[PDB]
């Protein structure tokens, strides 16, 4: 190319200046580079200094290389080909430079190039790189492998995509030759490469699986950590996708993994420990472990202690041996259930009461970890353990306090189910104290644990509501920011647990001011809104009218957040390369808060909706690609329908066809909320609903006859069908034979409320229009009517009119034989109310 002395001297001068200890020289060197980088020719100088300029020292050559790298990831589109090709050429030609720093710099350049732009645009990178493995010089093959490894890491899928002509059909069968290789580094690269294409079930690998597995075993004997680490994760991945292939060697594999899990090198052990975690997901787990389980449990238990460094760090967090071991134990507990207890109880006895806090803490962890799996088996021990754990809450070691919070929370169901004064009361008391711990980890552990307890206790908290709030409020003034987020969640779940009991002037006055205070601090782009808003949602629903003095600004901000999200999305859709896609969670939380507001206030939200474009915003939300957005919007739709239908009615003709295209059970909660919504709009439409029925009925009937459909979806589907029939018996009653069974099965099990009332009025009207529609399945109807504890008088008369009607249709004889099949409660009930 064209490097001239004057040019070179200037850049070297600038490179020297960038290495100055002087802070001002630095700031002005920054702006000097700022200008130069936009000149493609400058990049030519940069690579030249890296690869060609032998004269220059290593940190100078490499820094030139790195500046170039930054350029290749903010300006690469604007590179002409002539410079690009000069860099590409110059890199691959120096990939094995005897300087490790130069080698690394060249390497980042290659891989960054491939990454940012070269996608398929570098057609002969991979082919040359592969052949560069066959080369003589050690550094050369090492450098090439390093590059390949990195390419596979961020590029993984190069096969599954096929944007280049199936390139992996060449590479994979090429790595395993180097498994055999004399040097540890190369072995690692080779394995680390192959490993990238296991879970993907990569064609090239799957039809080469035997060669892989054989070569892996050949490595089992290797003592080089990096190799062990990679072999370990190979086996883990293989276990998930090629179960068939490793059964015949399973004993030897388990023996190997169990050894490595006990490796003194933390990293080997962690990769080894993943084996147990994924093995526990396979149905063949019990059979495979029989010879090794007795050793595995104590080994897992021992790795669940904090490491020595973590102990030191936590005095003054991501995946590690402790977490993996604890997670593995958790799943194994769910697999073995009560069979695990004889393995674990002798360990617990030595751990739970131990004089060394680290050992004790691990014991408490274990106790918590196994809670879900071994719950039945632990019941006998809880009258002793729970009081003991309660004591541990005031242990003088913070790390003991925090884990106790969690473990106790894992046994919340049992606690709540016992007399309140024996466990619940003292537990709640000590948790509250612990919420105000001076230690921040404890604060959140306690707060998290209390929330869990709240969820389980529900109304059982009502007597202690004042005492609870005292602490939660005080925490507002105590907590820094991170823990205020968990606190909002605890308040949120409290509001859900105690419902309307929360509606007291004193409670509102102590609770609301600090909630709004943080509301005013937070900006519309701060994710920390999510917990606050979700908290507000629950409070609003619980407070109802009590929320009146607070609604307006809350309402405005939410609509606004939805508006700006929709805006940002359109803007991004127009020019993706210039405007960031928005975080739709802001929209989800805002809709969900508007839903709560509407549920809480009911009719009293009218004035706000009157002044609002919320419905025109909803129209786009309902059509969003993201299920949760639709799910939130259908919920708000249902709420506004009940609260102030006059504003909704104009939109129905647009809204219905969309509701009709979202009755897809694949999206349970979207389907559910759409279904609920259409039931509520029915009631408001009356017979005006007739034209919309066909676009919705067939599907609802399909969904209510569908196996493996959640209880709640089926209940809403039944109610809605009931409701459609009430307003338009003529359109729906012909379908009676097809839905009456599951309709009845589903609704006999629900509480007597307005919705059930509404749905049964519908089923009566339909029977009056098509009685031969129920005759064959009348027992179901009988049972469903018998499920009513206190039906309204008119609904009752409808019932006995249908019952009397049926008995008269079949005559005293057929009736008495039909009623023979009545369980006693049923036979008895329809004489207390119905005289049949």
């Amino acid at each position: 190319w064209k490097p001239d002395e004057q040019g070179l001297q200037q850049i070297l001068q600038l490179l020297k200046e960038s290495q100055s200890p002087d802070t001002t020289i630095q700031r002005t060197v920054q702006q000097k580079l700022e200008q130069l980088n936009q000149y493609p020719d400058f990049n030519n100088y940069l690579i030249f200094v890296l690869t060609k300029l032998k004269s220059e020292d290593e940190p100078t050559r490499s820094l030139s290389g790195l500046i170039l790298k930054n350029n290749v990831k903010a300006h690469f589109q604007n590179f002409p080909n002539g410079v690009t090709d000069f860099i590409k050429s110059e890199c691959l030609n120096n990939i094995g430079d005897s300087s490790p720093l130069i080698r690394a710099t060249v390497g980042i350049l290659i891989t960054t190039i491939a990454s940012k732009g070269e996608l398929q645009n570098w057609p002969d990178l991979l082919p040359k790189l592969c052949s560069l493995l066959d080369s003589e010089d050690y550094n050369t093959c090492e450098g090439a492998f390093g590059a390949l490894q990195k390419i596979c890491e961020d590029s993984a899928e190069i096969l599954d995509s096929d944007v280049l002509d199936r390139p992996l059909n060449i590479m994979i069968p090429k790595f395993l030759q180097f498994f055999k290789h004399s040097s540890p580094k190369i072995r690692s690269h080779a394995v680390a490469c192959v490993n990238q294409f296991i879970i993907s079930r990569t064609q090239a690998l799957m039809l080469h699986i035997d060669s892989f597995i054989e070569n892996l075993f050949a490595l089992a004997g290797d003592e080089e950590p990096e190799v062990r680490k990679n072999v370990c994760r190979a086996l883990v991945m293989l276990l998930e996708v090629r179960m068939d292939r490793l059964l015949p060697h399973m004993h030897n594999i388990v023996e190997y993994m169990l050894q490595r899990t006990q490796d003194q090198d933390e990293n080997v052990a962690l990769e080894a420990c993943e084996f147990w975690l994924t093995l526990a997901e396979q149905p063949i787990c019990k059979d495979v472990l029989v010879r090794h389980l007795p050793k595995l449990i104590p080994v897992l238990v021992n790795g669940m202690k904090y490491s020595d460094i973590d102990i030191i760090l936590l005095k003054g967090s991501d995946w590690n041996l402790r977490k993996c071991s604890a997670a593995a134990l958790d799943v194994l507990a769910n697999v073995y259930r009560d069979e695990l207890l004889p393995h674990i109880l002798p360990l617990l006895k030595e751990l739970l009461f131990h004089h060394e806090w680290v050992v004790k803490e691990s014991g408490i962890l274990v106790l918590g970890a196994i809670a879900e799996g071994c719950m039945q088996g632990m019941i006998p021990y809880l009258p002793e353990l729970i009081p003991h754990l309660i004591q541990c809450l005031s242990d003088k070691k913070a790390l003991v306090r925090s884990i106790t919070c969690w473990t106790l929370s894992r046994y919340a169901h049992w606690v709540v189910s016992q007399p309140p004064d024996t466990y619940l009361k003292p537990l709640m008391t000590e948790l509250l104290k612990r919420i105000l711990d001076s230690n921040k980890r404890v604060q959140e552990a306690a707060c998290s644990a209390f929330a869990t307890l709240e969820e389980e206790a529900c109304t059982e908290l009502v007597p202690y509501l004042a005492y609870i709030l005292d602490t939660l409020v005080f925490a507002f003034s105590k907590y820094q920011h991170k823990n205020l987020l968990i606190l909002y969640d605890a308040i949120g779940t409290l509001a859900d647990s105690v419902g309307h009991h929360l509606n007291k002037p004193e409670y509102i006055q102590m609770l609301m001011p600090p909630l709004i205070q943080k509301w005013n601090m937070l900006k519309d782009e701060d994710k920390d809104l999510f917990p606050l808003l979700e908290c507000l949602s629950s409070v609003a629903t619980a407070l109802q009218s009590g929320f009146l003095p607070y609604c307006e600004p809350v309402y405005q901000r939410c609509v606004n957040l939805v508006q700006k999200t929709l805006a940002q999305a359109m803007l991004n859709n127009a020019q993706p390369d210039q405007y960031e896609a928005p975080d739709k969670d802001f929209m989800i939380v805002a809709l969900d808060l508007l839903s709560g507001l509407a549920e809480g206030l009911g009719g009293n939200i009218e004035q706000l909706v009157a002044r609002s474009n919320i419905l025109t915003l909803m129209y786009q939300c309902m059509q969003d690609k993201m299920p949760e957005v639709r799910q939130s919007s259908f919920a708000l739709l249902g709420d506004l329908t009940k609260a102030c239908f006059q504003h909704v009615k104009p939109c129905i003709a647009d809204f219905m066809p969309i509701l009709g295209t979202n009755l897809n059970p694949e999206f349970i909660s979207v389907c559910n909320n759409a279904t609920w919504a259409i039931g509520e709009i029915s009631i408001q439409m009356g017979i005006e609903m007739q034209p919309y029925i066909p676009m919705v009925l067939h599907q609802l009937v399909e969904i209510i006859n569908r196996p493996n459909t959640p209880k709640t979806l089926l209940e809403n589907t039944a109610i809605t069908i009931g409701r459609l029939g009430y307003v338009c018996p003529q359109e729906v009653a012909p379908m009676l034979q097809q839905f009456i069974r599951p309709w009845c099965t589903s609704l006999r099990n629900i509480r007597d409320n307005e919705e059930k009332d509404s749905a049964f009025r519908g089923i009566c009207t339909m029977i009056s229009v098509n009685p031969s529609g129920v005759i064959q399945d009348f027992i179901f109807f009988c049972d469903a009517v018998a499920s009513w504890i206190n039906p309204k008088d008119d609904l009752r008369d409808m019932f006995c009119k249908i019952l009397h009607g049926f008995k008269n249709q079949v005559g005293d004889e057929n009736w008495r034989r039909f009623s023979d099949q009545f369980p006693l409660p049923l036979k008895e009930r329809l004489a207390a109310f119905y005289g049949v």
């Binding site: 999510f530 979700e534 969900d592 909320n673």
Partner: peptide, 20 residues
Amino acid sequence: GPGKMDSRGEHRQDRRERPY
């Protein structure tokens, strides 16, 4: 039961402190 499904409770569970 009969009514809308929300993810609020689930979102709170995701944010909750866990030792693993």
